[PDB]
Design a protein around this ligand. Structure first.
Ligand SMILES: O=S([O-])[O-]
Ligand SMILES: O=S([O-])[O-]
Lengths: 152, 152
């Protein structure tokens, strides 16, 4: 599983009819790529790190507060392009990306877990598989990358 | 070297002077968050630049993943992003020991920006304020997020 996490002052997600369907203020936008061979342990890890990474400064301290500490939100967005392989040519290929039907179930299960580990009202999502327009106010910016197939 | 590339309809980069003032802007094109590693060689940088300029990330009324940023005469906003080397494996406070030290990194980055201009066009390459806090409003188009680590 891969995730690109970006610290934001807000984000506004839109889909084509453009129309708004999701919005957050301060918090994280998480581009989430699900792998062909991802287990639930892979998803737990991502969820844990999104909720607990200390990406905000506080008072005298830096990298001190996490998204929950500040009661901030998460916009969780499915992003298979993160498995776009560009090693062998300029046309990205996504053979590693878990197939769209199983991926959607996995993603939904992941969104449930996010809400369970945090707060139902604090977890926003995008339209899985659909073209989306997302206006993001990057705060910093702060971009973090995690590939669960780097730990075991 | 690591880069997170995101397809955008535009991006507006600001720095603090309530102070936030604009210093960079693109319309359609790529925003590239660039992390420079302690052990990066110019070959590492060449690779990134090549992939940013040549990845076919736009559809072409006929073919998906068909056109690259140059083909469309689109722009690139190149942003330094050491947080990409933020290690989160061992705890929730990211540590950036792998990130090339700030002074050598700045030279490398500047050299990289020269090469971008370059291999493309002087007017097509926008940058951020290295080492400074930035506010970046990004209109993510898709979105399309690509990740590349040259040490792969
Ligand atoms: O937005 S500025 O780089 O023309
Ligand atoms: O001037 S900025 O780094 O707050």
């Amino acid at each position: 599983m891969r995730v690109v996490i970006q610290r934001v002052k807000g984000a506004i997600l839109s889909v084509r009819k453009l129309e708004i369907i999701s919005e957050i203020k301060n918090g994280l936008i998480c581009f989430l790529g699900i792998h062909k061979n991802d287990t639930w342990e892979d998803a737990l890890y991502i969820i844990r790190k999104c909720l607990n990474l200390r990406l905000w400064n506080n008072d005298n301290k830096t990298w001190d507060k996490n998204v929950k500490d500040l009661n901030y939100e998460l916009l969780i967005v499915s992003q298979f392009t993160l498995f776009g392989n560009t090693k062998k040519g300029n046309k990205p290929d996504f053979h590693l990306a878990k197939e769209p039907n199983e991926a959607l179930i996995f993603y939904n299960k992941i969104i449930d877990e996010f809400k369970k580990q945090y707060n139902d009202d604090k977890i926003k999502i995008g339209k899985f598989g659909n073209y989306m327009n997302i206006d993001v106010t990057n705060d910093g910016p702060v971009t973090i990358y995690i590939d669960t197939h780097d730990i075991n």
